[PDB]
């Protein structure tokens with residue numbers, strides 16, 4: 724299936740990030756790190772002009788939950804979200820936790836990933 | 852179809868991170884951010900006692916290359932590496948770039964990911 728979940732939002736980059744942080748907070752997720760990919764590359768004189776910001780988010784209890792079931796899940800932490808502007812429109816997307824964890828061949832872990840995916844998806848929908 | 856590439860090292864957690872940072876640098880990869888999952892969870896009072904540190908690394912030129920091939924690859928950036936200890940032995944692992952982008956059904960992108968994967972794995976091998 725589609726490896727990612729992406730939504731179109733009416734707001735610009737800055738306000739989208741603002742609203743996403745509030746939506747995540749409502750769900751117990753905190754932003755651990757924000758990285759402006761576009762800035763990092765353009766500062767190096769590289770040719771990449773699409774505005775794009777990557778956010779590493781985390782809900783401590785959810786992290787502990789998955790790590791205590793399978794240590795290798797750390798290879799997919801923290802949860803990643805990406806806010807970018809394509810064709811003059813802003814979007815928020817994320818690789819699906821169930822697709823990432825699915826590669827691990829751990830049925831039970833994938834079901835916990837599904838809970839996480841549902842919550843992150845809800846956070847994204849609130850930003851439409 | 853192992854989703855990850857992991858190596859055992861003889862060094863302790865801190866020395867290992869130091870050696871990995873150097874190995875990465877020699878290959879043009881800089882550490883953008885890192886954090887101790889263990890400290891974070893224990894700080895929150897949760898039960899997780901396995902030493903584990905996650906590093907987000909970047910080689911700007913390589914990032915520009917995949918992003919310009921397919922924007923959605925941003926959903927898998929920056930490159931992730933994990934240093935952790937199991938049964939008293941330190942290990943360094945990474946989810947395979949080829950496995951991650953493989954879900955995108957994009958042969959051209961996967962070829963670039965294979966190039967990046969080989970280089971990152973070399974960095975890991977050099978810490979043994």
Ligand SMILES: [Zn+2]
Nearest residue numbers: 735736737738
């Ligand atoms: Zn603006």
Ligand SMILES: [Zn+2]
Nearest residue numbers: 737738741742
């Ligand atoms: Zn505002």
Ligand SMILES: [Zn+2]
Nearest residue numbers: 737740741744
């Ligand atoms: Zn903000």
Ligand SMILES: [Zn+2]
Nearest residue numbers: 762763765766
């Ligand atoms: Zn700037």
Ligand SMILES: [Zn+2]
Nearest residue numbers: 762763764766
């Ligand atoms: Zn900069």
Ligand SMILES: [Zn+2]
Nearest residue numbers: 781782785786
């Ligand atoms: Zn989490």
Ligand SMILES: [Zn+2]
Nearest residue numbers: 788791792793
């Ligand atoms: Zn259990």
Ligand SMILES: [Zn+2]
Nearest residue numbers: 785838839842
């Ligand atoms: Zn939950």
Ligand SMILES: [Zn+2]
Nearest residue numbers: 838841842845
């Ligand atoms: Zn629900």
Ligand SMILES: [Zn+2]
Nearest residue numbers: 844845847848
């Ligand atoms: Zn929805």
Ligand SMILES: [Zn+2]
Nearest residue numbers: 795853854855
């Ligand atoms: Zn395995």
Ligand SMILES: [Zn+2]
Nearest residue numbers: 868869870872
């Ligand atoms: Zn250091």
Ligand SMILES: [Zn+2]
Nearest residue numbers: 869872882885
């Ligand atoms: Zn460092």
Ligand SMILES: [Zn+2]
Nearest residue numbers: 877878970973
């Ligand atoms: Zn080399």
Ligand SMILES: [Zn+2]
Nearest residue numbers: 909910913914
């Ligand atoms: Zn890179």
Ligand SMILES: [Zn+2]
Nearest residue numbers: 962963966967
């Ligand atoms: Zn190549």
